Write a protein that binds this ligand. Structure first.
Ligand SMILES: Nc1ncnc2c1ncn2[C@@H]1O[C@H](COP(=O)(O)OP(=O)(O)O)[C@@H](O)[C@H]1O
Ligand SMILES: [Ca+2]
Lengths: 77, 207
């Protein structure tokens, strides 16, 4: 029954490789951005708070759609 | 012929078996991801929201939170490099190292001219070559009692080829079926010339 075993291992692997590329791209980028922007936002707490809040709503969105995306890369639908 | 209709009913079922195994893996991985990354992303959204809440109320607590968010983004970045590397599986350059060890320590002289290292080899194909290679050298150390073993890794035009030759005693007639199968699966081939020691020619399309 190996015959099926080892071939199916090959397909998992491939599947694994695919997800891996997708993730790598989108996510590296999005996490760096979130770091950056959360830092600008900190820079404004005092000097311009309304701005800092908008920036934070932004960071919130990029984290949300980041989840979505991961979810999508691994979507079975 | 009808050789066609048949090869294609075969293709159809292979494909279906295919999407089941595929999907099973994707789900398993989806759980892993929820569990790590999904949680970190969610957390970042949470803290950034909290911070926003504290802008006027407690500016210091908000700054503290944003520092927290920055850290969890950093560490998540890490999680990701690691994950993806790990999911990429074992890499051919690395398998080369592995077998240098194995040979040297089973006391066999290892021969390797470094060359035009191929350029557009899918990660999957890289993995099959690494596998076929580990096994071929295993068989060297187990069956040949050769004194020397040379591996060549060359770009030929359709395909990458890796040969492994040993000046030892071809016995037998599991590993070899395994190699022919993986290789076969990627639209490549195994060849076995015993004309003077065990010589193995593992060719696979680049893709
Ligand atoms: N480098 C080698 N030198 C001598 N014999 C070999 C070599 N490689 C393979 N063989 C022979 O081919 C047979 C089949 O090998 P394989 O398919 O790897 O199964 P196993 O290693 O379990 O025998 C081996 O039993 C071995 O005797
Ligand atoms: Ca073997």
């Amino acid at each position: 029954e190996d015959a099926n075993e080892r071939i199916a291992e090959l397909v998992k692997l491939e599947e694994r490789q695919r997800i891996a590329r997708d993730l790598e791209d989108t996510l590296g980028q999005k996490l760096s951005l979130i770091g950056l922007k959360s830092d600008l936002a900190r820079k404004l707490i005092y000097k311009d708070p309304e701005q800092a809040a908008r920036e934070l709503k932004s960071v919130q969105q990029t984290a949300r759609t980041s989840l979505n995306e991961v979810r999508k890369i691994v979507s079975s639908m």
